[PDB]
Point group: C5
Chain length 311, copies 5
């Protein structure tokens, strides 16, 4: 089989569409997501023209091996898509209507800067390479782009699924390539992070600040060191759900900052004990009373500054 | 091969049945389950009819490639089902009886609101897309819907496996689609959660309340902070077995509430120590004695309120 | 190809055998095991009979596609077995000898009631469905049932591999089905559980009982709360190696009971401190001295009761 | 195609060779390793003999389907090997030279008795089953047994890759079977275990012995119980990298023994406190001073005994 | 099909190129990475030569089965590459242009000596085995070596993708083999290691040094033992992200050294308490005051020495 011949000199236009059936396994660490969808393709092949009078039928049904089919691939997939042809319908003028159902693991980078209050634009890049006989170009049939109402991505809200209608046509290894960008816009469901990580992390921090109403050094050491260890556990828990980034994330910034608060609280508890032992408790009392106001105030202002820098 | 032609203008009715052989791997985080079952299909193909008295044969056995077979798919599967055709039988009037054994990973959302005392309705959606020649509609043969007695889903009780007999007929990408909903009703075996998570979590909380019968600040700090850390470990353990939800689960609510009890217990232990240091122990004694009643009473009433809101 | 015709009205007997080559990956949580074995099949096909003299051959070899082969399946497998035909030999009377080597992941429920001192009976269920032409029944050729001497299942002792010679014949989707039960009897190697979990768990418990020879409340709180946390770690470790069961396991029972001992030890440590503060140490001394005997005695008797109920 | 006929009554000798290209994923828990290698086969087929003078060709190249090829399998593999035929060459006398590149997951038991100072002999068992026409026997062509210089198994040193030249010929399911044993000798790189597990474990143990230079019961309880918990963490870490064995490993023995040292240290700390409270500190001083020598001395001698029993 | 015949006695030159489309899953423990790329091949086959005037075409498009294609393999892959042929084009003089898109998991050793400030050279080794008929040699077409601008390897910076133009020609099982080395140079994004592991590890160490401003033995024991346990947690966390190496890594060296600092801090805290109890506090004061300077100074100098030895 060979490509359809041009009537004049034009490129062959392959109309495309993606209809999402299932979205699952958005893996933050791997920066992948799995998709189950319909891929629709349409092109004119006049060599397949027929008379409904002679053949009896108004539409011809073909097997993929029987006719020429454009070699359409995905750019950002781990392995080639698992595809099953649903239908190949040829109309009397030779217009082919191809429909396949596929499943694929898509690699799409994620911006974790505002995590867990982040939004993402996932991409599915469709591509075709031109052949010697003819140049092939891709187009979007907007009537065949969409998603099932039941499409749910656990832990995310699906906003939209649209296609950039203009393909990116470029030269690659001395041949033309036609690339389409299908965009799935999603926003993270931050809800569960509040009772599971944010509030527990704030509770243990506020518990360490009870040391500013205690003169007992041994109890103070226990309060600040124990809550610090619990903070380390939350830091480790959070970093297991995330990849290593060459930038600070919002959560990462807060988690890092809270270490500084634990470090300065240990200094305060040490300074307080040292002065008490040196028979200077009046002074220790001034530092401890100031700390009761300074620690929550600096914590609030530092969080306002961080929220401002990130949002 | 082409679809069987209509005698009048009627859609082709494909009778379906699913008989469960195995149920395994209900993954709560992934919201998937694996299934091994029989899929039965039945439709009339008049082009295949034969005489019973002339032929001598009551039934004719065909290979899948020899005859037309409807393209039946599952909506909510990760990848296409792994299927092996078992038998194809044709009756004299041309009634085809198709049987395949398949295995599939099914995506079906779970409602964790009442976890671990939750019940679920798992779905297996059967679908067929109509052809240009004619419309294909699905039906349920209740005689061919069921499950093996030995079907066990580890950690769950299987209640029923039924089908919604009326299909959901709708247009998708300019062709009719006929969808059937097979429902597997299950209820979680909550038993093991009681000795492994619920009672250990209650024991450590009650151990923190022994601080209300102690005047030793240093021992009190050790009691409340150590048990809090053990509570954090249980919180982390529980959240590893569950996906992130945009709602509170019953267990999540109790786990979150128990933090408030630890936080107020730390305030009480701090207030008690502060007053004793300020030579006001009579008062500290009033707060500590009130706490002995208030903490278990507010804990009981808050749990009655939560159980009422969730069940 | 069609099934061999009956001389009278008899069912077709397919003689079976399973010879285990490899046993691996017994997954307790998943209740699965992987198997690599020979599957042997034997039946009479009159249509393939020959005379040895005029043929010059005592045996005839065929390709699977050339002749009729019974559709033998496994009931309790995740996916269909990976099989490769080794040999197909036909004797003069048309007796077919089929041999395949296969690998499969088998689902077989496990009884964890006596864990880690438990024994199991793993099952491999062989099945065949009848055809309209004739009833197909399974039999066991005991001469072709066995296992390689080197077959080892890591963490288990293999006792026997036998077959229940009488098949379970029953109707399924209006056709008769013939099922054979191959049983692999195994017993768990409990050895490693003694130095890794049982003795460490006993050591930390006995360490908490040193609080009955101490009047220091602060030290006592540290002894009982620290060892309790280590007990929680062992509880979590044990429950990660096991599925959730709607019953108590032997280890689960002991682990749960040990919490009660920690809870009562905290009450004792609290009561002791309370009385000392109330200037009643003579009394506290009576409770502490009684506890030194009561705790190990009640622990021994409770363990004798538990061992009796479970074994 | 059928096997080459015997000139007299001799068995068909299939000469074999395995050339390792890659070794990876030695999984201690699973007792598996992955291999990527060349498999070379050689046998005489007189039916393929030709004249080199008149043919003008020294060698003929065939496709696997064109000629008879012996069914060679691996005994100890999870699934059948993934193989790609590289070349088939026939010499004028009819000697066939077969070469394939394969990849396989091999099951090979490991002896953990001396872990992490252990050495292993990994096995790759080659097998052939005799056909009805004639008996097939395996041989080793030492000229075609080897490994690439770059073959590296992460965490191990590769010593040798040799074959036991005499096959194990035996009857299995009324046929002959010819088995070859390919041995890959490896020794574990114990280096990293010293700074990561052994020395940290010794440091925390020696830290618990500082309690023999302290009269503070509260500090002593904290020293011995905290380091014990850290020892439990190392015990858990070590047992996650290993399967459960029906014998003691060297590391397992040391880890278990160190619990006894923690248990006796708690007794000593308890006895010391008890005597001080009973106004017998002179005596407590004698036990504590003896403990300073006894604990390191008994620890050294017990380790010499253990090293002797294991090496 | 057979290889192109030599005009004189020359080896057949196969020109190669690799164009990277995707780079993902660099697994440090496994020492693997996944790649999705174009593989281009070019060679002269005179038997395929044609006259452009006579044929009426300037290029000829074949199917892989229709013509001879060199058996090109990757040396350092887990399994054979997943490949799909994109195009085969023949010029009038018989110059074949082959293009395939492939995906593979590549084995490539990593040097962890400078981790997490390390750089790596990943290798993709292309290989061809000669045939009896002629010798096959590989070459690099630099015009067909490259990478897509969007190629990103999570946690790494991609520096260059080049090929060593001179192949490594050698004998393997009496046949010539021609090997090409494609090199992907990468450098680790160490950024996230600073707020997540390095600074938290320094903070807990500096917190242990507050014991040099405290005379409270019980508080000191709590400070040094608690922070040591947190250091053990970081040691375990770090070693889970890395394979076991027969050498010290930079991070491993620092982590190991920090144990020595904890060990000597415990000795100091013990010596200080012992002297106080022995009524020698003036002396204890001299050791504690010296420790305040000695510990940070020796820590800084030891780190300068380590950084010098490693970089
Ligand atoms: C410890 C610090 C506590 C965390 C503070 C909340 C983070 C924040 O400030 O969150 C802000 C995000 C909203 O983000 P948005 O509209 O997506 O951003 C895009 C914004 N533009 C378009 C203007 C640039 O979430 C919320 O609605 C806040 C609800 C969470 C409350 C948590 C309480 C604890
Ligand atoms: C800490 C708080 C303690 C937990 C309290 C039990 C939770 C609960 O209230 O559980 C309730 C569920 C019953 O659920 P149901 O009939 O399926 O609900 C559907 C209800 N409709 C149809 C009326 C809407 O379980 C039980 O049978 C209780 C047994 C668990 C005891 C645990 C003791 C500890
Ligand atoms: C904490 C309490 C310590 C645990 C006590 C052992 C459990 C037990 O009693 O184990 C019993 C099992 C034996 O069981 P069996 O013959 O398979 O049972 C079938 C019994 N019928 C046929 C009579 C019904 O193991 C043993 O050989 C005991 C050795 C373990 C010693 C552990 C010491 C610590
Ligand atoms: C805590 C106890 C400390 C561990 C003691 C080392 C174990 C041992 O004794 O190790 C011995 C093995 C050597 O073994 P080999 O020659 O392979 O054995 C075969 C022996 N035959 C042929 C004689 C039977 O390792 C070593 O080279 C020791 C280096 C490790 C030092 C660890 C310091 C900490
Ligand atoms: C505890 C001690 C703190 C660790 C100190 C940093 C390690 C280091 O010294 O890192 C040095 C590397 C630079 O390495 P380079 O140029 O790739 O090496 C090749 C060198 N040649 C070509 C000369 C051989 O990173 C940096 O730029 C330092 C940034 C990290 C700061 C961490 C602050 C905490
Ligand atoms: Cl693709
Ligand atoms: Cl499907
Ligand atoms: Cl099967
Ligand atoms: Cl094999
Ligand atoms: Cl390859
Ligand atoms: Cl050489
Ligand atoms: Cl050569
Ligand atoms: Na085609
Ligand atoms: Na068909
Ligand atoms: Na303490
Ligand atoms: Na057949
Ligand atoms: Na063959
Ligand atoms: Na070819």
């Amino acid at each position: 089989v060979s490509p359809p011949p041009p009537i004049a000199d034009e490129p062959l236009t392959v109309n495309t569409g993606i209809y999402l059936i299932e979205c699952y396994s958005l893996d933050d660490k791997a920066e992948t997501f799995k998709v189950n969808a319909f891929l629709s393709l349409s092109w004119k092949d006049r060599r397949l023209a027929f008379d409904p009078v002679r053949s009896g039928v108004r539409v011809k049904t073909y097997e993929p091996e029987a006719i020429w089919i454009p070699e359409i691939r995905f750019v950002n997939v781990e392995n080639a898509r698992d595809a099953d042809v649903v239908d190949i319908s040829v109309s009397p003028d030779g217009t082919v209507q191809y429909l396949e159902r596929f499943s694929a693991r898509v690699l799409s980078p994620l911006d974790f800067r505002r995590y867990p209050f982040d939004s993402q634009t996932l991409h599915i890049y469709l591509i075709v390479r031109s052949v010697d006989t003819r140049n092939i170009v891709l187009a979007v049939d907007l009537e065949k782009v969409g998603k099932n109402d039941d499409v749910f991505l656990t832990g995310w809200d699906i906003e939209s699924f649209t296609a950039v209608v203009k393909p990116a046509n470029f030269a690659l290894e001395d041949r033309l390539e036609s690339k389409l960008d299908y965009q799935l816009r999603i926003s993270r469901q931050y809800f569960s992070y509040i009772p599971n990580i944010i509030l527990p992390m704030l509770f243990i921090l506020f518990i360490s600040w009870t040391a500013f109403w205690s003169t007992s050094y041994e109890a103070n050491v226990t309060l600040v060191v124990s809550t610090l260890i619990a903070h380390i556990a939350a830091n480790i828990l959070v970093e297991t759900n995330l990849p290593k980034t060459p930038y600070m994330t919002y959560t990462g910034a807060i988690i890092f900052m809270i270490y500084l608060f634990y470090f300065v609280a240990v200094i305060e508890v040490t300074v307080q004990h040292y002065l008490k032992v040196e028979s200077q408790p009046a002074r220790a009392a001034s530092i401890t009373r100031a700390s009761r106001i300074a620690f929550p105030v600096v914590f609030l202002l530092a969080n306002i500054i961080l929220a401002f820098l990130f949002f």
